Amino acid sequence: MEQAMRERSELARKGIARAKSVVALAYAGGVLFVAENPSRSLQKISELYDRVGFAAAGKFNEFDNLRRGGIQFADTRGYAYDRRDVTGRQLANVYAQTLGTIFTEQAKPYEVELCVAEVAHYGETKRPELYRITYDGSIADEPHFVVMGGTTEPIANALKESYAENASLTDALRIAVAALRAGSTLGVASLEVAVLDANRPRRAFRRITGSALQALLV
Amino acid sequence: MEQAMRERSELARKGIARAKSVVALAYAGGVLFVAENPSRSLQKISELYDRVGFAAAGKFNEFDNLRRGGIQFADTRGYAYDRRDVTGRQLANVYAQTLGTIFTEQAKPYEVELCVAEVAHYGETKRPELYRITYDGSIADEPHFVVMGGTTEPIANALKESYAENASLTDALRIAVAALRAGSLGVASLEVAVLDANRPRRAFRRITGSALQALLVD
Amino acid sequence: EQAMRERSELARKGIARAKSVVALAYAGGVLFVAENPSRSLQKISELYDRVGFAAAGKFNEFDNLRRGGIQFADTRGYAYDRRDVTGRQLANVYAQTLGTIFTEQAKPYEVELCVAEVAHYGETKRPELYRITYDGSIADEPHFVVMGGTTEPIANALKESYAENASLTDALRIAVAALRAGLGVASLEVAVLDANRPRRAFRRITGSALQALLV
Amino acid sequence: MEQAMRERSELARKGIARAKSVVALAYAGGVLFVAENPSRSLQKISELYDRVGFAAAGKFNEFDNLRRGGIQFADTRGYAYDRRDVTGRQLANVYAQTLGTIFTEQAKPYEVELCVAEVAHYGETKRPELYRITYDGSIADEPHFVVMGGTTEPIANALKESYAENASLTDALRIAVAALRAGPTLGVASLEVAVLDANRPRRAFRRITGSALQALLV
Amino acid sequence: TTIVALKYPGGVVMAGDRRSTQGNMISGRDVRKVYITDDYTATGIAGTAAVAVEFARLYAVELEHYEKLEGVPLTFAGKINRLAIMVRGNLAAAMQGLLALPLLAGYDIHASDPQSAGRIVSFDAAGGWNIEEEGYQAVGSGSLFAKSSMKKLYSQVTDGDSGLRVAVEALYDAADDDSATGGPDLVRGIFPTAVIIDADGAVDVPESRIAELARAIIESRSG
Amino acid sequence: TTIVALKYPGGVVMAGDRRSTQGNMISGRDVRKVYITDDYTATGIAGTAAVAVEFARLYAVELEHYEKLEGVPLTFAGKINRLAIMVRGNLAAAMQGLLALPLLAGYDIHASDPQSAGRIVSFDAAGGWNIEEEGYQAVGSGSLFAKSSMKKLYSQVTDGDSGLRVAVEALYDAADDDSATGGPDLVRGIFPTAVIIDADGAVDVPESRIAELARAIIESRS
Amino acid sequence: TTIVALKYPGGVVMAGDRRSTQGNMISGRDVRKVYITDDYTATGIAGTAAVAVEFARLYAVELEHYEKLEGVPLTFAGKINRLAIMVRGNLAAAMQGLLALPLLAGYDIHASDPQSAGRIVSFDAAGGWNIEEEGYQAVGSGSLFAKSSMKKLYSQVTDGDSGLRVAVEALYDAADDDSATGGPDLVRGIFPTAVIIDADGAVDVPESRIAELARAIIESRSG
Amino acid sequence: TTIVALKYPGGVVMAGDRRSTQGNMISGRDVRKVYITDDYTATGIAGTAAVAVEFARLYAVELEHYEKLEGVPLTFAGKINRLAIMVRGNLAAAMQGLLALPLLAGYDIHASDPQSAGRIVSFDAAGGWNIEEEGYQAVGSGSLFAKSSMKKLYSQVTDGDSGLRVAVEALYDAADDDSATGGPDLVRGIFPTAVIIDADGAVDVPESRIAELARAIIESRS
Numbered sequence A: 001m002e003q004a005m006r007e008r009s010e011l012a013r014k015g016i017a018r019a020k021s022v023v024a025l026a027y028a029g030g031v032l033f034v035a036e037n038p039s040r041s042l043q044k045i046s047e048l049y050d051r052v053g054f055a056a057a058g059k060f061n062e063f064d065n066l067r068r069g070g071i072q073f074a075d076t077r078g079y080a081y082d083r084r085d086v087t088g089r090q091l092a093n094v095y096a097q098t099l100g101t102i103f104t105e106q107a108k109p110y111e112v113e114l115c116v117a118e119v120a121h122y123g124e125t126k127r128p129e130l131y132r133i134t135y136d137g138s139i140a141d142e143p144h145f146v147v148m149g150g151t152t153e154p155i156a157n158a159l160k161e162s163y164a165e166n167a168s169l170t171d172a173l174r175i176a177v178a179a180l181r182a183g184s185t186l187g188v189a190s191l192e193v194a195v196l197d198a199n200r201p202r203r204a205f206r207r208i209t210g211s212a213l214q215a216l217l218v
Numbered sequence B: 001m002e003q004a005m006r007e008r009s010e011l012a013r014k015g016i017a018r019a020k021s022v023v024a025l026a027y028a029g030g031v032l033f034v035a036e037n038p039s040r041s042l043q044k045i046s047e048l049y050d051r052v053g054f055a056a057a058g059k060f061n062e063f064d065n066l067r068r069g070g071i072q073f074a075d076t077r078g079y080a081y082d083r084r085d086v087t088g089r090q091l092a093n094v095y096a097q098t099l100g101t102i103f104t105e106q107a108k109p110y111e112v113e114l115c116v117a118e119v120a121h122y123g124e125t126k127r128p129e130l131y132r133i134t135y136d137g138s139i140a141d142e143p144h145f146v147v148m149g150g151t152t153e154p155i156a157n158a159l160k161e162s163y164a165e166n167a168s169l170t171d172a173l174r175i176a177v178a179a180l181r182a183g184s185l186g187v188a189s190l191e192v193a194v195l196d197a198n199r200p201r202r203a204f205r206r207i208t209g210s211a212l213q214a215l216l217v218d
Numbered sequence C: 001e002q003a004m005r006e007r008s009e010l011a012r013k014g015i016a017r018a019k020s021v022v023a024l025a026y027a028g029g030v031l032f033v034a035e036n037p038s039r040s041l042q043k044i045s046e047l048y049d050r051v052g053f054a055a056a057g058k059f060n061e062f063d064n065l066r067r068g069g070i071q072f073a074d075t076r077g078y079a080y081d082r083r084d085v086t087g088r089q090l091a092n093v094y095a096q097t098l099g100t101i102f103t104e105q106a107k108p109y110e111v112e113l114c115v116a117e118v119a120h121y122g123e124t125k126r127p128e129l130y131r132i133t134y135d136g137s138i139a140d141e142p143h144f145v146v147m148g149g150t151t152e153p154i155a156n157a158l159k160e161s162y163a164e165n166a167s168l169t170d171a172l173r174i175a176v177a178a179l180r181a182g183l184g185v186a187s188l189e190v191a192v193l194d195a196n197r198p199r200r201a202f203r204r205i206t207g208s209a210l211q212a213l214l215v
Numbered sequence D: 001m002e003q004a005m006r007e008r009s010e011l012a013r014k015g016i017a018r019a020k021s022v023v024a025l026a027y028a029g030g031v032l033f034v035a036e037n038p039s040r041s042l043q044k045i046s047e048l049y050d051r052v053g054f055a056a057a058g059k060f061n062e063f064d065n066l067r068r069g070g071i072q073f074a075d076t077r078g079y080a081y082d083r084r085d086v087t088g089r090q091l092a093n094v095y096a097q098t099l100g101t102i103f104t105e106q107a108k109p110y111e112v113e114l115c116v117a118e119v120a121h122y123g124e125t126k127r128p129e130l131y132r133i134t135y136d137g138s139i140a141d142e143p144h145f146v147v148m149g150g151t152t153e154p155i156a157n158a159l160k161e162s163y164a165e166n167a168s169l170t171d172a173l174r175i176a177v178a179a180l181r182a183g184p185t186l187g188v189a190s191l192e193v194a195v196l197d198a199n200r201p202r203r204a205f206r207r208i209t210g211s212a213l214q215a216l217l218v
Numbered sequence E, G: 001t002t003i004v005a006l007k008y009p010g011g012v013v014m015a016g017d018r019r020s021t022q023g024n025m026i027s028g029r030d031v032r033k034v035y036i037t038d039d040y041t042a043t044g045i046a047g048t049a050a051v052a053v054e055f056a057r058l059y060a061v062e063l064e065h066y067e068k069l070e071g072v073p074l075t076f077a078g079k080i081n082r083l084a085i086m087v088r089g090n091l092a093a094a095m096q097g098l099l100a101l102p103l104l105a106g107y108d109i110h111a112s113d114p115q116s117a118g119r120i121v122s123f124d125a126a127g128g129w130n131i132e133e134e135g136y137q138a139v140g141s142g143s144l145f146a147k148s149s150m151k152k153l154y155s156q157v158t159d160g161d162s163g164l165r166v167a168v169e170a171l172y173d174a175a176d177d178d179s180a181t182g183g184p185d186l187v188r189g190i191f192p193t194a195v196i197i198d199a200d201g202a203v204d205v206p207e208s209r210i211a212e213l214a215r216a217i218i219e220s221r222s223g
Numbered sequence F, H: 001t002t003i004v005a006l007k008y009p010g011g012v013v014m015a016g017d018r019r020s021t022q023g024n025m026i027s028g029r030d031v032r033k034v035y036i037t038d039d040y041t042a043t044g045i046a047g048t049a050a051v052a053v054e055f056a057r058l059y060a061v062e063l064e065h066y067e068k069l070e071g072v073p074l075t076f077a078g079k080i081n082r083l084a085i086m087v088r089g090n091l092a093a094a095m096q097g098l099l100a101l102p103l104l105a106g107y108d109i110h111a112s113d114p115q116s117a118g119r120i121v122s123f124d125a126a127g128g129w130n131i132e133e134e135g136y137q138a139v140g141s142g143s144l145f146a147k148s149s150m151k152k153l154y155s156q157v158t159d160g161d162s163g164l165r166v167a168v169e170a171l172y173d174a175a176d177d178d179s180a181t182g183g184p185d186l187v188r189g190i191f192p193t194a195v196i197i198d199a200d201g202a203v204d205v206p207e208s209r210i211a212e213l214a215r216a217i218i219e220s221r222s
């Protein structure tokens, strides 16, 4: 009972530590997601709703299950009520409930760690919200950045030193790539980058791939 | 059997002991809730029904599940019968049944400690009621104050000698914040709300921002 | 902890005892080569128009998964359109399916799967290869995939002797050679996803045509 | 986990090894099944469909259940599509899936060894097919012969010596009985013999009993 | 059937006739249609006899069931809602002829002012409910004749006794014009029943007081 | 029944009559048909009394249920959707005579221009919803007469008081032509009810004000 | 209602009227019946208002739901099939008066020829779908008047603006002969809505350009 | 609609018209009603357009579904039985006007006599199937005019090209007498579609060849 739950905790923590790292930070235009990802087609960052983004670290099929569940929840909520009623907070809230249930009841706990991010609606001024949901369902509201997966502490402290509010997109991308390298070369071939762009009219999520990303890395 | 229940009781007691502290107390204008909370989006205190409030300590996803179930129970009860038929005693009774079933049947017991408070309806004279429900379904009727989460005895004793019936909101607030200090405190680290017995119907109201600062200064 | 370690051990050991399978991209699409002494029981299969399947391990189990992927692909192609079926989403659902099996089935599956997609006719698109292991781990591979038995000798042999846009004959001999470090018409199952076919790219290379391709 | 499947494979090994032996051989007239059976009414070799036959070794009630289930599958498949869509490869595939499920999921694994054989349809020249399916769902197709039950390796190597492709009927029967005694005198009272006769117009399965069988053993 | 209910200073009165019919034929002469359903409420029901009786019995069980489970009686509004839901759930059968139409009288101990703590609630076949504010109501085939009579007599209501007299006269006028409503049977000595509710609760009115009032009404109509 | 709603600079007004009928017979003189659904919304319902009352009661509970579960009230569009879904779910019963036809008035606290943040949404029996853009709407057996009256009177609307007066006059014209809509009752002192909503929320209009306006209309037309 | 759609070199146009009715009565004057369902797709629906608006909102959610789940949008043929299946599932309710008849216009990003990448798909109440090849299509009670008008006007379609003009004039002819279709309202300033889709995506047409074209058509017909 | 199918030495041809109607109105001019269902099988369907389209699509995926699952295509009898089961399952909806009537033409690679491997199978609304042995068959509202036209012209079928011309002429006769079957459109350049199936499989017939045969038939009629 007490070491069974601690064994589940250690299995999940080990699984999250063995995966590559992800960073989400608030910049002047919204939220930047930067994850170490060598794959061309398998994604760790994703759109959830109009102004709500998703980032995960850990076992792919498990955080992909939760990614799909989040999109299902968000779309169902926006249809049953109205699009504007969907918030990043309630998406993090249901992620915390779901991971809590999984951690206690499923055969194996999920070796995953989630970030839910929300930017302001178009034309409205509101600081980005960042939420972290760990494998046990614990939920944390962060103001500036979230680091997930692998050796997190060196990346967290690199951001602790070099992060500045309202930085440009290029400045934020440099800081994020540098902080990731502190935790472990990283180029367009090994990066998955996307933003929640608060200047988009409806759907804020957009990926930065290939030529555009290379241009912002120089 | 007896060791299984001792282990589950110990897991829950430790989980609550490692949690931040909440107090609720009666004052001249109704009931006051104060809790140590640095989050700006997550909440441990909430409205349940017109004259019934809710406060919890422990794991968030678990007492948020119970907060939601209690809101479901109250809205259904008041609709099937009438609003005045819902009472704090009923909700405490439901939480006691719910937590007891959780404690004996779920894979992991809930690491939560709940307070349900009820104030008088508008224009009526009635003492506030305070109910404490623990992780095993045990339930207690309290006349002056309730403390939950973490190291309770310093906060409890601080309130014991310092509690004054019919205290001002300002007085009772300072008393409660000081009692919280005895254990593990400004606007940024506090969640505070009241069940205001003078509101015509919905007695619950939060005290945040400049109004909370003004009440904290004097 | 011990339950999942024993499950992973049973799956890993079962796959280590199985015969080996190779899939690699060549100039004509994707080539599957597997050591298979049977004439009727197969380890390589079509999934959809431009999507192929290869597996190593316990037959009844990867055959269940083979049929399951076919059911998925035909259902999705009918509920939407044929072009909406991709190799990526087939590998995605295999990862979800194997993850569930590994954690919840009475016995984990001793299987390792490959999903491969070539371009539709008339389009120039690099082939895709996916490896999905017994626990639902999913890997994106650019040139080749090796599964079953002792994979390290075969993988290294391919790593140094792989040529992009190689001919069908050259790719086939590279594959058989890499498998030898672990073989004739009677002991090989060979099939290709031929990117030059108009719709159904999957085609088996069998008997006399396979012999001519080897010699 | 390892201990469970270890003991299950052990239990099925012992049960099959204790039971009596069965052999199926491809000859010039089709496929011949020879089994040691002293009973007069309990049958180990059976028809499955038009050109498909069934032979088993082990616990009777268990391979009788599997025999019936194969008859349900083949009859259902031939009605839902057509008779000529039922193949021995299909029925062997279904037996592998079925025994795999039984081995991993039922209270006790089946102590059985199955052979499914198919001969050509009337007027056609197609090489016979034999399939062996073990208690755990392992399946292999053979070109010449299949041995099941009891001590198999002596019989298998004996046939590996004394097998001739496209041999005579009585030749193959005496070859089979000679391989069967290698693991002292086997007459009609000790034998169950049948054939899939590729020369019959539809139902190839036919038994060989009493006078005829004894005449084939002179 | 006719069941009347009216408010008087400090309480309510409910009274009902005694007749059951099967077409033109009289099938009952002493039917009791006004039920004390708890310490402070009475229910009078018109319609199909079987459904009306089952309704009153089940409704009283439901109120007492809640009180024992929860340690407190339902609020008067809660009592209204449970009755309305009961009627609503019978809508399909009522459309097949199994109709029950209740009328609810009560005394709300939690009311603001005790003088007008009386409550009269009428219902319809869809489960609609309406708290009455003009002092009186009726239900049944004679309810129009009863309400029009009470329209003219209600100003005479100053206390419980005159309230009972007006209710008895309203029933008399209903039976005068509606053959499905029974009048006083002086031959058999059978009279309408009545329930009075005030701060002390709901009590049955003795038939002898009803009889005296009915006889006085009959005498005045005679000349 | 006639229930009216109209926009005025910085708010919205909803008013409804007090009559219930059972055929030609008058069965109610005091019915309250306009409900304060929440702090910024009012609902008025025509149709079968049992259903209309249940709709108003259930809708208010649903809105508050969301606010307590989620810590924030629904957007006004979400409120529209939930009412439409309620009506749509009643369609079969409505075809059987259990009809509820709502009209929604609100003040959107998240609209950009507060001067025009008032909202009026009409519905149909299939659950259709249409946000009105011409400033007024009505529902019930007298709604045609009220909409045509308001068409000629809406130019007079400059603030809450004149919006209330026009609303009451429309209800007067509806009762003038529709026997199923109740006029002002001077003998009993019973008058239409009204709710007015602005940036400070929804409030019931005191009966005395509606009495004043009703008597003025009657005096004028005599 | 009348929704029109037509192909022009490089893209597609869809326009629709603004009227709703209940019987003979006009019940809406600014109804928006043409929805941008994704970045390259527009849907216009005729029939029962409640069902039409629900179809459009659910269909747009369904397409975005797939895009977010799978990382790629549906092929245009996949979008057709989901819309057709939605109509088919409504056939029973449609026979009871809850009819929705959509029209689909789109720009296929995966088409062969970018100047013929415009798509127009018409539907029937049984879930039938047919990709139009003659360049234009319409749906609603004025669709036959609109199609026969576009038959004579289609030759003047050379780009996006001339295609918009033809669409507006078709709607004008539809409203000229069908009272359930609304014509331009010059007193209120209300005009049909329109969406244009090309390689750069789907965009709402500003009310001003539609108003200018409507006035041009109007005074061209008045003399 | 008219779909025709006829056997020629060593193969089979199926051709279909291009028209869809909504009552009297013409609603489609380029409908393709003849489908290549697999390498050796074609189906033409008449009836409610939605059901016919859905039938051809789902039948093709079912045949390929079996092939991929089992490694071998269905026997021709199995293909017949699955199409019959599909029609039989639609019977209740067909009685409500969602009718699909298919016609099956194919080349049996497992045929007993390789010279006579051509196959024509017709069906009814109840799911009944009949292997046609008189060399031709038709389905749809013009099937009687087409079958009577082919009864006279079938003696001219000596190879695949003459069989195609007869099939096209039978469709021409059906359109001549049946307004629900479309004839060649020389203004728009639209002609029936056809599929030919022999030992080398089923292939779409080029439109240029069908247009040539149609023009020759038109000139021989005028």
Ligand SMILES: O=C1CCc2cccc(c2)Oc2ccc(cc2)C[C@@H](C(=O)NCc2ccccc2F)NC(=O)[C@H](CC(=O)N2CCC[C@@H]2c2ccccc2)N1
Pocket (backbone or CB within 6 Å): E001, E019, E020, E021, E022, E023, E027, E028, E031, E032, E033, E045, E046, E047, E048, E049, E050, E052, E053, E097
């Ligand atoms: O007519 C019937 C038969 C049931 C029926 C069939 C078809 C249509 C129909 C009713 O449709 C109807 C037919 C007739 C009516 C309603 C519906 C009028 C109604 C009535 O008088 N109701 C007065 C009344 C009101 C409240 C409580 C009791 C009570 F009798 N009468 C009735 O239902 C009569 C009642 C009757 O004769 N009996 C004889 C023995 C038991 C029963 C009784 C029970 C309890 C008390 C007094 C009598 N049943």
Ligand SMILES: O=C1CCc2cccc(c2)Oc2ccc(cc2)C[C@@H](C(=O)NCc2ccccc2F)NC(=O)[C@H](CC(=O)N2CCC[C@@H]2c2ccccc2)N1
Pocket (backbone or CB within 6 Å): E122, E123, E124, E125, E126, E128, E129, E130, F001, F019, F020, F021, F022, F023, F027, F028, F031, F032, F033, F045, F046, F047, F048, F049, F050, F052, F053, F097, F098
């Ligand atoms: O006519 C009836 C019988 C019930 C019925 C069933 C099936 C079809 C039907 C009517 O067919 C019908 C008959 C009549 C109508 C609709 C359908 C009109 C409608 C109305 O006036 N509606 C005005 C109104 C609007 C909103 C809220 C309350 C309210 F009364 N009237 C009604 O439903 C009347 C209402 C009635 O008399 N009573 C008496 C006590 C309880 C009920 C009431 C409740 C609440 C307030 C005021 C009255 N029921």
Ligand SMILES: O=C1CCc2cccc(c2)Oc2ccc(cc2)C[C@@H](C(=O)NCc2ccccc2F)NC(=O)[C@H](CC(=O)N2CCC[C@@H]2c2ccccc2)N1
Pocket (backbone or CB within 6 Å): F122, F123, F124, F125, F126, F128, F129, F130, G001, G019, G020, G021, G022, G023, G027, G028, G031, G032, G033, G045, G046, G047, G048, G049, G050, G052, G053, G097
């Ligand atoms: O007639 C009704 C009532 C429902 C009904 C009952 C019986 C038969 C019937 C339909 O059968 C029918 C009756 C009438 C029609 C169809 C079926 C025509 C159809 C129409 O105009 N449709 C045009 C249109 C097309 C797309 C989107 C919106 C839109 F209004 N009208 C309708 O359904 C009308 C619409 C209507 O008056 N209202 C008033 C407020 C809300 C609703 C509206 C919603 C959204 C936009 C504009 C208006 N409802």
Ligand SMILES: O=C1CCc2cccc(c2)Oc2ccc(cc2)C[C@@H](C(=O)NCc2ccccc2F)NC(=O)[C@H](CC(=O)N2CCC[C@@H]2c2ccccc2)N1
Pocket (backbone or CB within 6 Å): G122, G123, G124, G125, G126, G128, G129, G130, H001, H019, H020, H021, H022, H023, H027, H028, H031, H032, H033, H045, H046, H047, H048, H049, H050, H052, H053, H097
């Ligand atoms: O009439 C309708 C509406 C559905 C309906 C309602 C009431 C009775 C009824 C059918 O009952 C019927 C009414 C009419 C028919 C059948 C049943 C004849 C039948 C036909 O022509 N069928 C020829 C045909 C055969 C095979 C494949 C496609 C094809 F169009 N016509 C139809 O179903 C017509 C078809 C039609 O107009 N459209 C326009 C856009 C989509 C649909 C189409 C799809 C695919 C291709 C071409 C057209 N639908």
